[PDB]
């Protein structure tokens, strides 16, 4: 968010990448994968970046 | 937060541990360190765990 720092967002993005590459996760619909990352507190941009990197 | 999976919260807690171990950070008042982590999106439960592991 607007008052946060990259240091604390970067591990969430990194985990999200590993999440999106995981064989269990990949069996769920794209929207469900995105909703899961949203419930993890990731911003729309962070989710989009995770998908790019995955 | 409570809805987060350990897969995502543990790496964040790990990041908070590194934060709390930092020499400059340790110079700041306790309340300031906790509040900094709160504005990063950690809950008191997660901050307590960070301190526990620090
Ligand atoms: C390496 C990444 C693989 C992650 C693959 C993870 C598979 C999802 C498991 C379902 O998660 P959850 O139960 O919503 O979260 C746990 C949070 N609590 C149980 C609500 C407290």
Curated annotation (Swiss-Prot), chains A, B:
<protein>
    <recommendedName>
        <fullName>Peroxisomal membrane protein PEX14</fullName>
    </recommendedName>
</protein>
<comment type="similarity">
    <text>Belongs to the peroxin-14 family.</text>
</comment>
<comment type="subunit">
    <text>Interacts with PEX13; forming the PEX13-PEX14 docking complex. Interacts with PEX5 (via WxxxF/Y motifs). Interacts with PEX19. Interacts with tubulin.</text>
</comment>
<comment type="function">
    <text>Component of the PEX13-PEX14 docking complex, a translocon channel that specifically mediates the import of peroxisomal cargo proteins bound to PEX5 receptor. The PEX13-PEX14 docking complex forms a large import pore which can be opened to a diameter of about 9 nm. Mechanistically, PEX5 receptor along with cargo proteins associates with the PEX14 subunit of the PEX13-PEX14 docking complex in the cytosol, leading to the insertion of the receptor into the organelle membrane with the concomitant translocation of the cargo into the peroxisome matrix.</text>
</comment>
<feature type="modified residue" description="N6-acetyllysine">
    <location>
        <position position="18"/>
    </location>
</feature>
């Amino acid at each position: 968010g607007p008052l946060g720092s990259p240091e604390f967002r970067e591990p969430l993005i990194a985990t999200a990448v590993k999440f999106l590459q995981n064989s269990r996760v990949r069996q769920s619909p794209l929207a469900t994968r995105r909703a899961f990352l949203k419930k993890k507190g990731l911003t729309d941009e962070e989710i989009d970046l995770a998908f790019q990197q995955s």
